[PDB]
Amino acid sequence: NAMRNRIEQALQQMPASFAPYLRELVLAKDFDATFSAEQYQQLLTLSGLEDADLRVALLPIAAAYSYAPISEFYVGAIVRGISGRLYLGANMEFTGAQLGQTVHAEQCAISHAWMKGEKGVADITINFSPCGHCRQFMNELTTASSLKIQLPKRAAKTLQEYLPESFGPADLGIDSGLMSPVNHGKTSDDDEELIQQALRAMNISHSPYTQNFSGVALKMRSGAIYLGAYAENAAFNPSLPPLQVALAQAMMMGESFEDIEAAALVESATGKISHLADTQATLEVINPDIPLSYLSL
Amino acid sequence: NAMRNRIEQALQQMPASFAPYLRELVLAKDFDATFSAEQYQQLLTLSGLEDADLRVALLPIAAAYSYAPISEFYVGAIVRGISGRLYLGANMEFTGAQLGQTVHAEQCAISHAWMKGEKGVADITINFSPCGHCRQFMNELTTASSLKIQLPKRAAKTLQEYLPESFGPADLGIDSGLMSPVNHGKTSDDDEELIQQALRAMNISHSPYTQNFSGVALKMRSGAIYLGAYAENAAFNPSLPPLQVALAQAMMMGESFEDIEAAALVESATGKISHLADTQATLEVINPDIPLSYLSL
Ligand SMILES: O=c1ccn([C@@H]2O[C@H](CO)[C@@H](O)[C@H]2O)c(=O)[nH]1
Ligand SMILES: O=c1ccn([C@@H]2O[C@H](CO)[C@@H](O)[C@H]2O)c(=O)[nH]1
Ligand SMILES: [Mg+2]
Ligand SMILES: [Zn+2]
Ligand SMILES: [Zn+2]
């Protein structure tokens, strides 16, 4: 885990009541930046705190994963999936790339729950009040109208309270299904294993506005492979490209971007857009030696 | 053309009270998608309507400028600068490019007001509720706290009502100054005139988070020149790149992007990001024959 040093700082400030148990979990080799419902129950019992208070108290663990070399402003978010599992996320910024390549903690935590199989978000606890871009991103979700947003000691609020008279999928005559299960059924006989992995990500992607179903697969020095599916948004700009999603999974799993050895991008030949130019440009600012395999299908 | 036809369609739907004078202004060979305070007052007197209802009535003139090859969803906006002059705007989409390149109507109308000299927005009128991305963009303005947002038959609202507990420049320790008077005073003895024009835009650009003061100049086959200055945002993703701004100015003057002959991008050597990759990639989906001159200053 490349972030353990910063995680240790966050742990050093955690209340004595639950720090030992949290430490045992977060410093474990395979810590995946998630907490099961059972582990959460144990944190509650041990902390003696009310639910909202405990989630807020855990935020620094999420913020410890922040990669913000442009702003040096560290944002952490905690998403409780509808299953009850908690998923951590942090913001990511890319020096030398246009700001549309930025990933917000909220987007990171939500993509983390989604790539791990959640069908929706129950609530999200955030370091700072969510910006309009994140509010709008959240409105694409299956649980847009039911999820709760929690800031420190403040009352929890629904998305609608943070984004009154919202614009969303409905306005483009489409249902709000980000996180709903899908299989686009795309198939390829390509012999490259990294392409086939990206294709699995493409097959669960959400792109009802451009039909550019797409995915990215990142192979690491360790041999691990991280997938990222495209999460498009009705307002267009809040869309989260597949690379950003893959990078987020790698980061939350404790990987260093300096350890990426290869990337693969797979997209739709009939998509109204392409992520190729931006995937290449962003990989170049990360490491110009990373080769990118590509397939339009 | 499609644009001329939509304008004609919009005109035919205007009440006879002011349609004849509106026609006269909108069909002028020099119409620049703006209405002077005087022209607007006269239209108001001819119409016998209340101020807010006339602005709403004029919305289809702005929407007629929409360039939406992806969604075919035409959004129009009318920004009233603090001078009293009205500036039209519409959404802009680019086939083959990542969605961060999209421009919302609200962004277009505001950048139009900004590029023509306005130091603040008094009010913005629109057909639909602004999405979160636009709300976040407006929160960067010098008049974020005083502007009004007008929708059809609804009372005017403040940005705070649409964006409660907002995130913005203050959270990053900075004043909200987009549209305030700016002169970075940068110079260059570069003998290329198009670079000199792009530098004029760069010298008024807004980039307090990355310091990538930047500008673009577009030259049409006719010889008309359009300038665009970078309008960065504290939420990062809602930042409006300089190409986008210049294309907005071209579009509101009635130009066709097929008629762009050359482009120039000027940015800062100490910027934490670069617009090069995305400027070349977007111009490429517009017309691969358009050359891009570049200077990192
Ligand atoms: O709600 C927000 C607002 C901002 N940020 C991050 O804060 C920095 C400045 O906006 C960027 O890295 C951005 O992604 C978030 O993660 N979430
Ligand atoms: O408030 C909004 C929401 C959406 N759009 C435009 O509508 C299309 C679909 O979101 C895109 O071109 C987008 O820029 C706007 O102009 N303003
Ligand atoms: Mg002020
Ligand atoms: Zn945000
Ligand atoms: Zn918008």
Side-chain angles (χ1 to χ4, degrees), chain B:
Chain B
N1 59 36
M3 200 281 294
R4 184 179 64 87
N5 292 351
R6 290 165 184 169
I7 289 287
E8 177 57 30
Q9 291 182 302
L11 291 166
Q12 289 178 8
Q13 257 37 230
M14 298 296 177
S17 63
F18 65 89
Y21 186 59
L22 184 56
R23 234 167 213 289
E24 191 175 320
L25 300 176
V26 165
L27 298 174
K29 182 171 182 293
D30 67 350
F31 181 60
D32 66 347
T34 76
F35 296 106
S36 68
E38 184 184 17
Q39 291 167 349
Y40 181 73
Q41 178 58 52
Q42 173 65 33
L43 284 173
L44 184 47
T45 299
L46 295 164
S47 80
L49 300 177
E50 287 177 353
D51 182 29
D53 293 311
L54 181 66
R55 281 179 286 116
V56 162
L58 301 181
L59 286 166
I61 293 299
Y65 283 80
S66 180
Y67 179 64
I70 300 178
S71 66
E72 297 298 356
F73 183 76
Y74 316 117
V75 194
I78 303 186
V79 160
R80 178 191 276 156
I82 56 174
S83 74
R85 187 170 171 194
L86 299 184
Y87 305 87
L88 284 47
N91 57 319
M92 206 166 67
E93 301 167 353
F94 302 99
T95 310
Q98 211 179 57
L99 296 187
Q101 302 295 300
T102 309
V103 178
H104 291 238
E106 295 82 339
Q107 288 178 299
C108 182
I110 296 169
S111 76
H112 185 205
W114 174 46
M115 294 304 302
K116 284 185 178 169
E118 295 290 347
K119 298 170 292 180
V121 170
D123 60 53
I124 188 176
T125 304
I126 37 192
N127 28 177
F128 315 103
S129 289
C131 73
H133 163 92
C134 288
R135 302 176 195 198
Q136 189 62 50
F137 185 81
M138 291 182 284
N139 200 34
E140 191 79 25
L141 303 169
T142 54
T143 55
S145 304
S146 63
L147 67 81
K148 303 303 189 176
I149 299 167
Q150 184 66 57
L151 282 63
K153 310 283 280 298
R154 286 189 169 81
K157 287 182 182 57
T158 70
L159 184 55
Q160 187 279 139
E161 293 176 310
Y162 278 110
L163 195 65
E165 290 203 48
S166 61
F167 172 93
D171 302 285
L172 299 179
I174 283 182
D175 187 43
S176 298
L178 177 57
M179 299 186 70
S180 63
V182 178
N183 182 16
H184 302 297
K186 305 307 183 186
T187 61
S188 173
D189 57 10
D190 195 300
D191 62 22
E192 188 173 343
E193 187 59 37
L194 196 55
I195 288 288
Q196 292 294 340
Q197 295 161 318
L199 185 59
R200 187 192 299 159
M202 181 262 265
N203 273 319
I204 72 172
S205 65
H206 181 76
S207 198
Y209 315 101
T210 62
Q211 298 81 54
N212 193 43
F213 311 113
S214 45
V216 163
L218 297 167
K219 184 180 190 186
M220 308 302 295
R221 301 201 196 286
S222 64
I225 299 299
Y226 299 100
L227 307 181
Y230 182 39
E232 200 164 69
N233 190 268
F236 281 33
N237 307 64
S239 301
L240 191 56
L243 178 59
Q244 269 63 20
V245 180
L247 289 168
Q249 312 318 311
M251 195 184 66
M252 302 315 301
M253 189 68 218
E255 298 291 9
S256 166
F257 305 143
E258 295 187 354
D259 298 336
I260 292 172
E261 167 177 307
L265 167 59
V266 179
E267 61 183 357
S268 319
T270 57
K272 294 186 183 175
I273 62 175
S274 172
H275 295 295
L276 182 49
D278 276 300
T279 306
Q280 313 201 260
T282 296
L283 286 169
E284 167 157 294
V285 303
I286 291 182
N287 188 340
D289 293 339
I290 299 170
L292 175 65
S293 302
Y294 176 75
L295 184 56
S296 180
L297 188 60

Side-chain angles (χ1 to χ4, degrees), chain A residues 176-189:
Chain A
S176 292
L178 180 50
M179 297 184 74
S180 68
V182 292
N183 173 10
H184 302 298
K186 300 298 188 69
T187 190
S188 175
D189 55 357

